[model samples]
Target: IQAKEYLENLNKELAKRTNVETEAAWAYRSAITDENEKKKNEISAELAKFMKEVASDTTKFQWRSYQSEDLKRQFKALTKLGYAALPEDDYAELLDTLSAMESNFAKVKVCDYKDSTKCDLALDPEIEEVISKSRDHEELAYYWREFYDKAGTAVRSQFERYVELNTKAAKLNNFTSGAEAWLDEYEDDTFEQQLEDIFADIRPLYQQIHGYVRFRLRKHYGDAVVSETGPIPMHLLGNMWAQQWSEIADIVSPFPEKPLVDVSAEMEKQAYTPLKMFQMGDDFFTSMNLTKLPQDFWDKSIIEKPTDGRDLVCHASAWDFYLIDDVRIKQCTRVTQDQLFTVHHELGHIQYFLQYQHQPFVYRTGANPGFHEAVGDVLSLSVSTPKHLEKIGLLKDYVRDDEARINQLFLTALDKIVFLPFAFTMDKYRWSLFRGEVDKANWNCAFWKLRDEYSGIEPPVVRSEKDFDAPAKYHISADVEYLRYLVSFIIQFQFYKSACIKAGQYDPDNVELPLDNCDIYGSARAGAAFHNMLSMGASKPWPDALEAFNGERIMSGKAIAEYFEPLRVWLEAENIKNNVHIGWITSNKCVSSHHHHH
Candidate 1:
């Protein structure tokens, strides 16, 4: 009873702090953009002081026991300030730095100076030279990211120092690292280990995916050449194959839904229409109904008047309260379909939030970011299928024939492959920056170059300037958190693969609805199942949650590999098509080809 009362009081306090911080954050951003530099700095100082007070009060709250729930709730409330302040130029600068590092570290360059008349040498000499050049390029990219990472570390260190001084002034306690301190305040003893374990499991999967990519590139290169000096340059293989196949010519339209509210409205109708028609289990119904906000007093759906003086108000920007509003989503005025998908993704977050809102504040949010991100990512997959599109009258263009279906499958596979390494590399680079190994001078151009190499596309210089470095700027300025998305990507794939098996699509002989059929991709019916698995919030460890969700231990590698099976198959098929001549063979005994000759 005491614990319950404590949580109740904490929630009220959190709501109040959240409101103040939100307004203060807005004012701070407005201040920075003011034409008068003196006024801007003054406003900044005021905002900073207000934030310091909130932080001090938050620290005063006990964060070590079940009592930590109150502290956790308060911390989440304070996060609203971070979200609200995203649009300021400082925030933009951080994102830009992040993008720069990412582009530099991940770019692919070719060993073009192989076996030309300038230096006709034996195979050993040529191979060694090419390998040397490749290593040089790779190291150059790494150092560039290293510099950016150091700059970020410096900024984070400054923030920590500021926090330390303020805490001392306010007669509060101090922590080692901001992240460690923040997580400690949340009161989850096992949270860090959970994140580490999940990452360990997922790393192997990333390696395998990389292996498959190398295999495909090697196969293409071998087939295109018949030379002794290693069939083709590794860097040029991507460009050559992309040009030969003209896969780039086949363009698909983006999701047709406009105004994310439409997608949300449609999701609501599809999910609830059937529920309204039948009497269902209380747990299932509760999960579905929990997503809807309390209607305003003016709305007809107001079930009853408040018993006390308190009134529940639904804010349009309530995502801020939920603590999952990333800067990208918050800054956009007109949300794209992609962004709306993110909103639905965030709604998945909201579902989890509402589930544990009444629990101990320590257990209110996700056990960690990976778990939180998975909740949204898995739900967002609902929008990726033909059935969902057909329900909304947007599938006509792509579902007309088997070829079209194949095209859809191909595109999806391509996107999966393209995004995985990019995500992994970006996460690694960001971590490096956060740890203080990288500087900023060359971070931007270096990151952009890496991006072009990995994704096989260059930003038009104009878009490149705006988009490439944006994420870096946000990440460093915010602190080391972008890794959460990458971690979430891995976990989401795990759930996706496990769900597929549960639906009986994993068997080699299951031909009735082959994995190729888009319908097999889980439905809105699965949303409730996911919520049931995730809505326990931090009540259980992540692995325990995974076991509950899938009836097996969470294995990140298996999850990643399973998710990439479709892409692996697609790449193998492409390898077979361009069969020119090469000596290499896959472990599976498939003949390989090359697209470049040294």
Candidate 2:
């Protein structure tokens, strides 16, 4: 009885306060610029106090036999929460300093470059379109450098300072370094090796995928410009950071001669509004036997661009009010297939919010952060398919036959498969940075060097000490965790494969119902299975949630390799014919022996 009441008391209070903290966070990120800036700080301070208090109570509790799994799990979770807490002493100052550093990075505009009219990150779609849509190699090189080198230089020192302060903040709780501390906040013993193990599993597929993309690019840019074995020039490949190849889709897409499907253009031709897209997205969920979004979702979600664009938080994000039926998404939606898919992605999050609204606060989180990101993304992958689009009346005048299959597969692979190594490296670099293995003197040197080894892509400009090109990307500057994305990538497919299996669209040998095109849009079996899994949340271990959904918990790259398997065979034959090579590793070993200091 005492144990039950004690658990109940903390659960309710912490749960209540978490809602407030969630709102506070929503206020800051959704702000045009510090709309309730002071309250945000006060809220942060209060959150720190609660964290330390709950942490002290729970982690220090006497270990007694628990009668149930719920009791054992909940108790362990609160103790883990204690590790996640910052110091109550000087907490406000530390938090505020970190916030300021993030703000400096976020407020940076594309206007700094001589050529860009935009006033935000150089990778903003406007300038990136120059690389994606423009045929001018000179222009692509300019935009890539402007963003990677110039933007990196803009906030390098501030980031260095932030890293130092963050390290100290984590050390206050007796953690060796910030990265280990963050990863080890759970009862699980986390480390750099776990990430590497997963990367090595997926590394072979990337070799095949990278070589195929390089082979195609060589024909477009000529072998003189595109190297088969050495690093592909960053500008020629279509992404500023070389993390994604969507920009060069026009060149490498299998349907280069045929007009590719244009749902964005079709939606615009029909004058589709943002809310119309929302309705279609909602219908998608409803068709899958998921609950309709609550009325609050429709009223509260900022579905379209605000009339007043001055300092509006234009980036798209889904917010959980941490209350029942209190989910919303904030986005500056311009009607495009990209944003349409984003709507489904964001809706995936909102729908998951609805799925597990009944769970207690400690269990309110996704199985892990990876599951949270993957839920929406898993759904988006289904809805973005050519088959699904045609059903929604969004496809017109484009081939939907086998001719378009590789185009869809290639587009998705170029984004997801290409991103795997980049996502894996961000935290590797950051985790190493936390351990003093990587320092200011060699941060730039290590960044490109890691890119060469993992991504097989190199900077257009020969980078050096003068520019902090590595940390220019949003994830690093924004202080967001990148590993979740990698896990999300692997696990979303697991979720999708399960959904497809449940929907009877998957039989492993069926070529007509390709894994890439498996949409569970209207399947009750898939929806019920997903909802049941979501309800487990973090109350159960991630493995439990994984098993509940897929009968297994292993995150596999097999689905990815399989989804693009047909293209893989095609790429192999073409590669041999075209002399496209794959030995892209250079001497950047990522200080592989430097794992013990932490």
Candidate 3:
């Protein structure tokens, strides 16, 4: 209770200081752009003084004591400011200050990797180098707000003004645009070329996958009704996929049976199990059991661990593991398959945390945001595999069969393709907002309308009038980060594709992977492949990591081809009719159709 009160007071103080700093920063930026040089100088001086005061005050706040609610509120307020400043003259400066502050606040302070006393959980100098590079890349990317802002004249003029100022700022800094300035930070001479090559290589694969998906949709729902434009006609299939998933859920009932094994006790029995890497042919049964992490870490130490020396508690949610508190777990009588997957994904993150927890404050996070995302996503994929299902006793009598595996492939392809447009649009929207194309007043509504038009999921309740205030937009304002996730998704798909091929077959129904064959009563060896990838650290660029993983440099086409081939086979098997349903549907029941022949 004392801690709670302290946190509440701390929140109020931090919020007050933040507001003052934001306003002062805004004033300073406005002054710099003032047509009158005298006025600009006066405002700039005042702004600098105000910033110093705010920084001092903020420094007084103890980050280690920040509770979850306080952090959430703090970040929410910060986001609101980001939205409010979208169309203002000082928007970019405001963002720059916020980004710096947030970055510094999120910085971790821990033991260096080479420290003998600290556990070498996530110690990779190469990975640290890559993470630094990625941060530079993100900061540079943030400056590219000018182009979109300038382009916003067609729809919003404030955006154009913002871009103009941004351009001027870049020139003052001796760079042509934000992109050039950002690229200068990376040591890799071929980074730009790599990005271009990746996009080009993956596009054709995306199209191929889309084609196969279209065929499947036509087979599932007649060709005349499946539309390609103006929103995916998800309704056309009458929730067929949802129904099928529900059936699948039921078929795999009792869901995740807490394996009849004690993981914690088993780990205690093995001297090297807790901190050391498992060796090949190690006790798989005991190791698999050890994967079920202790619940104590979830509630207490995990949240506190990240803020050892920081003055400000991080303003992000506790990663998935901590979010599922003990109370919630117990209240929910049984764990579902989905819940099991969620747990494992979170555990993957915990493993990374434990490994890197001792690293220097600045290098504690995974080598990069993409690396952190991959840690969870790759593990999630492991759980989704047929091999994992069989090990967990969900697959029962299922056998390795090629044709039956098509459904799994179909699902993956559908999710990947269907999600692309929405992700692209979201990125564009954030770019526009930063450039001042959208103000805080109506951004939320615009976002919802776009979401409805694109992905087709409508929120049950609208919480805020302006879309900028919406929860989704919080991520953009708070993190100003996500492109890495997109990159990781593509990369993970590549890993999956290469792995499948190496196994000598592409059977979705093949549940015969090494992980499944591991001792169910022991520590699961699923982490081996994932850890091997991480061990490469940031020593190599992503492409290099891909090459190291697959014996060839990362090629987007391989990933695309792997994803599409399955879809194509499924389409053929399902006997899909082409050239039937391609059109747009509006909220008012207005339908527009486009007929294209293959």
Candidate 4:
């Protein structure tokens, strides 16, 4: 009884501090645009003390001394909160260090140098418009070069500072390395190893996918730009950084109709509002038998940029104020295919929160953090299908002919499959960096090392020691975890396949329905299966949740390989015909050493 009361009050109080810190930091970075750095730091410091207080309470006599069997039950349940408390337990000083690190990330700025002009790139929506999709290679190259160089040099210093402080934060929590400690937030030592196991399962398929993408590039651009055995220029891939190739998709687009359906043109013709998409996204979930979002999800969410002439962060994100009812998305939405897909993705997080609302505060999250990220994307695998889009009125329904299937595969493989290695390399870089295996001096080499091994691509520019190319991306500078994305990408398909199988949209025996032909819309069984796993949240270990939804005992990347089997076969033949090599490793232990490259 005593345990219940104190911990309840403690949880609520911590939520309040967290809400303040989260909102303040969002305002400072996204809405207010660094105008009130002092207040941001102040809220950060206050929350720092609050976190320290929570850690401090683990040592409190009243909290720890409860001895009743009921109290033991309560305490055991409390462990499900899964809060990352300091095992080494320094409340005051180390907490402050973390708070300072948080502030540095919020206040840091990047310069956007375009041509002879230089200015602050405060609007993400504006930059993403061209950076992700523009076909004008010269303009794309300009922004791509600035994308990393500006962040690499000016903002890179703070990332260096972050790595140091973050390493210290982990050591303070009784971890020898920050990445190891960070991985423990999900389960135990096995959580990261589980991610690795999945990565290994899928790496060969990804190598084949990478080889084919390169093969397509070699055909599109000549030997001057790409050789069958050589690396392709990252910028020309239709992205500034070549992380996603949605832009230059035309070069490799299998359909004669270019985009298959010009979603941009369709959106303009329909005059679709971003908010309309959000509401419709909710409808899709409710139709599946999941609960509807609260009225305030529409009423209270920030789905559009403030018209108040403020330079905001312009990045889109979903938020839950630690209250199940308070889940929301803050986005600078525009009428684009990306934003249309993004609404469903953000709502995936909200749905996960709603399903798990019955749990204690700490347990009211995805089975793992990556699980939350994957849910929306899992929905995306089916919902973003060309047929799904036509069903949603974004495009017209068309026959699923071979050409159409190949087109659908082209776009998704270009966008989603390509990110597989980039996702692996980012964390592969970070974990090593976090473990002190890579320093500022060796950061660039380590950054490209995994890129070559996993993605089969290399830097467009001759990257030397002076260039801080690793921190050029936002996630690295902000210290956001990257491995979640890779795990999410692999697992989303498993979740999608399991849900579709339950819906009878896919057959366990047939195996040829193809992802573009699968959707679980209006299927109650799928809805139930999805919610059943979601409701467990972190109540049980992730493996348990994986089993519940996946209908298997383990998270498998094989589903991705299965989904892309035809594409894989075609890619394999195309790659071999073009003399593109499939796998590379420098005695990385997982791949054949003699068959690998540096």
Q: Could you tell which candidate, 3 or 4, scores higher by lDDT? A: 4
By summed lDDT, which 10 consecutive residues of candidate 1 come out lowest?
240-249
Per-model TM-score versus the true fold: 0.52, 0.90, 0.47, 0.86
Model 3 residue 470 distance off true place after TM-score fit, in angstroms: 8.1
Of 2 and 3, which scores higher on lDDT?
2
Q: Which stretches of candidate 3 lie over 4 Å from their true place?
A: 1-230, 233-296, 299-339, 397-403, 432-474, 477-480, 497-529, 535-557, 572-598
Q: After aligning candidate 3 to the native by TM-score, how far in Å is the CA of 585 from where it should be?
A: 11
Can you tell me which runs of candidate 1 are displaced by over 4 Å? 1-8, 23-290, 293-318, 322-340, 397-406, 439-480, 498-509, 514-525, 551-555, 579-598
Best by lDDT: 2
Off by over 4 Å in 2: 59-65, 81-85, 88-90, 112-125, 149-151, 172-174, 185-198, 222-225, 397-403, 585-598
- What digit string (tens of lDDT, one per residue) describes model 2 on residues 272-342? 99998899889978888887889889888888755544444446888888777888898877787668877
Q: 1-598 in candidate 3: lDDT tens per residue?
A: 2234443454454434444453343333222222332333344444444433443444455444556643433322222211232233454454444343332222323332345374222211222222222323222222222111221112222323434544444444455543343333333566556555665554544444434433444444454544453333322221211111111211111112322111223223443221222121122212533233445443333222121321332222223221222211111111233334334434545555544432222223454445555554454554455655556444555544554454455444444444444454455445454444665566555655555554443332222441122222223324345445455566656655544444443444564532212122222233344444554544334555555556665435345445556555544433334442332344322222234785
Model 1 Cα RMSD, Å? 14.7
567: Cα error in model 1, Å:
3.1
Question: What is the lDDT of every predicted structure here?
Answer: 0.40, 0.73, 0.38, 0.68
Instruction: Please state every model's RMSD to the true fold in angstroms.
Output: 14.7, 4.9, 18.4, 5.5
lDDT of 1 by residue, 355-436 (tens): 5555544456676566776665654454555645665453444433434444444444434433444554454444333334
The positional error of residue 238 in candidate 2, measured at the CA in angstroms, is: 3.0
